[PDB]
Amino acid sequence: METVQDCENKLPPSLKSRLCEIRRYEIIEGPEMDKHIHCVMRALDFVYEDGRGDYHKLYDPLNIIELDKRHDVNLEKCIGECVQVPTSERAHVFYKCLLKSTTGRTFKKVFDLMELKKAGKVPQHQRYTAEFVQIMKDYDKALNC
Numbered sequence: 001m002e003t004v005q006d007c008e009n010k011l012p013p014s015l016k017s018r019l020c021e022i023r024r025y026e027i028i029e030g031p032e033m034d035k036h037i038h039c040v041m042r043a044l045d046f047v048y049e050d051g052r053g054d055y056h057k058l059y060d061p062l063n064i065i066e067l068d069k070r071h072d073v074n075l076e077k078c079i080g081e082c083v084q085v086p087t088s089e090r091a092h093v094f095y096k097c098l099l100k101s102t103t104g105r106t107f108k109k110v111f112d113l114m115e116l117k118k119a120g121k122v123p124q125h126q127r128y129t130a131e132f133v134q135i136m137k138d139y140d141k142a143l144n145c
């Protein structure tokens with residue numbers, strides 16, 4: 001599997017210099033970002049190959065971090081939205097939609113946890129704890145972020 005790190009390494013110079021924005025989930029539009037977000041959402045296994053959000057990769061993890069009937073509603077909304085867009089762009093629309101919804105703040109936790117869990121920096125059962133926040137801070141620091 002290509003990793004999030006591999007995606008970042010292949011960013012065009014124009015986007016590498018905005019890596020810290022990207023890793024803070026700031027939205028940046030345009031076709032190279034459409035490509036990057038597809039890459040990372042694939043790497044963390046959140047979307048299908050055409051870029052469609054996978055309800056089942058997120059419903060449980062979202063609810064375990066923070067139980068909320070809105071996660072269901074938001075997933076359906078954002079999947080509905082991404083399916084209406086060209087595939088070149090379907091991962092990024094899903095991601096943007098999720099971040100703009102009330103589920104956004106919990107999605108960022110699930111994403112951060114999955115990234116570090118795959119990188120072997122934390123155990124598979126790692127929760128979003130104070131220690132985890134510090135672990136991610138140190139992780140980003142080594143990336144110049």
Ligand SMILES: NCCc1c[nH]cn1
Nearest residue numbers: 022023025040112115
């Ligand atoms: N841990 C956040 C990495 C990221 C967020 N958005 C894109 N890449």
